[PDB]
Structure 1
């Protein structure tokens, strides 16, 4: 629907006022059919729109919702280094060991993208640095050579 399209666009842009006008019990968990089925919460999380993330969560957005590739909004936040968003999602019950269709977890994303504080947050909440994705790679395996601090963090040493 045009309304849902406008809502998804508003979530992506961080347009709080438009989100408030279009967010209904029926649209809060709508999906971008013409993309990868991101929900408003995926868009707000991935584009670091904190106020929108907050509003959506308050109004019943599903923190556990998977997109077409099996990503939850915590994946989006972690891949793009959005620490506050990640913390809000975890506080609202997001599963940290969640795995997409390729068995990538949020820790795989944070590690690969060089996000130390987010890795630390995930580990504090029980994220498993030993979980292999479908390629057989752990999050540690995906750490860039230059990020020796992240390597040490995930090694527990």
Structure 2
């Protein structure tokens, strides 16, 4: 029968095209590849296309040729895998990059809801995981077993990496789209302004109160990493109030440098100047006056800084 013979012959060429793709035989591939078989499927097993097999067996040049000659990057096998699944499962970085360049869907789900990242994570393909994340892969998506790529990552280091890089790329993408709400959401758990639950002190409050020799460098680093210079604790003390009351004059200057408000009032209506005056810290008072602290401010108890201070403080203050 003419129709049946044609089917058998086509099936033969098809089997051999698949074999050439699988083995990386470029000559054989280009001899067998036609518009009628470029997206053929194997008869048995997963019924892979030539692209699935070239991707899974790291046949970079075959992948290029298939895509150049009409191969479907989105072609599904019997289980719903796309070729990106195959490349990622086996850690083929160059192939993965090429499939993504040709429009492969980074979170494509097969019939068990496995994504390419499930594959790369589960088989510890560290570099490919990073690549996938940079293209928007989401490692929190669960398969049919309820497992995410994070759940499947075989090491704590890879798990940490998936989460960190996912947050990082999410932040970048939100910034690219100027998506203000997503930017805020990705930054929700930054620790720089973490507050001690009771007293509402931040690392900057702690730093400026520290007795240890590196407090100046530590406060400076915190401010560079985004510490709020005017954060108030439970008693409405800013870091300036804290530094002023202990005469930590080195850190006071960095606070001023970073825009610390001189006339912030604590819960008693006191400035940093009141607190310096009350404690008898002469140089602290001079520094605070030069920064533009207002000496006339009257505390809740009815006192100016001068009214709370010793003779030497009073002299400093009437010069202003």
Both structures adopt the same fold (TM-score exceeding 0.5): yes
User: Is residue 149 from structure 1 mapped to residue 181 from structure 2 by the alignment?
Assistant: no
Structure 2 stretches of 5 or more lacking a match? 1-10, 166-320
Query: Does residue 77 of the first structure (1) align with residue 87 of the second (2)?
Result: yes
1:36-115 matches, within 5 Å, as 36-115=46-125
The structure whose Rg is larger is 2
Moved over 3 A (4+): none
Cα distance in structure 2, aligned partners of 1:103 and 1:34: 22
Structure 1: runs of 5+ lacking an equivalent: none
TM-score (norm 1): 0.96
* Structure that is richer in helix per residue: 2
> Residues 33-78 of structure 1, C-alpha deviation per residue, up to 9 Å, x if partnerless?
2221100000100011111011001001001000000000000000
- Tell me, in whole angstroms, the C-alpha distance in 2 between the residues paired with 1:142 and 1:148: 11
* 1:116–1:149 Cα contact (<8 Å) kept: no
Q: Deviations over 1:109-133 (max 9, x none)?
A: 0000001111111111111111000
- CA-based RMSD: 0.9
Q: Which has the higher contact order (CA 8 A, sep 6+)?
A: 1
Alignment partners' CA distance in 2, 1:19 and 1:149:
41
**What is aligned with 1:128?**
138
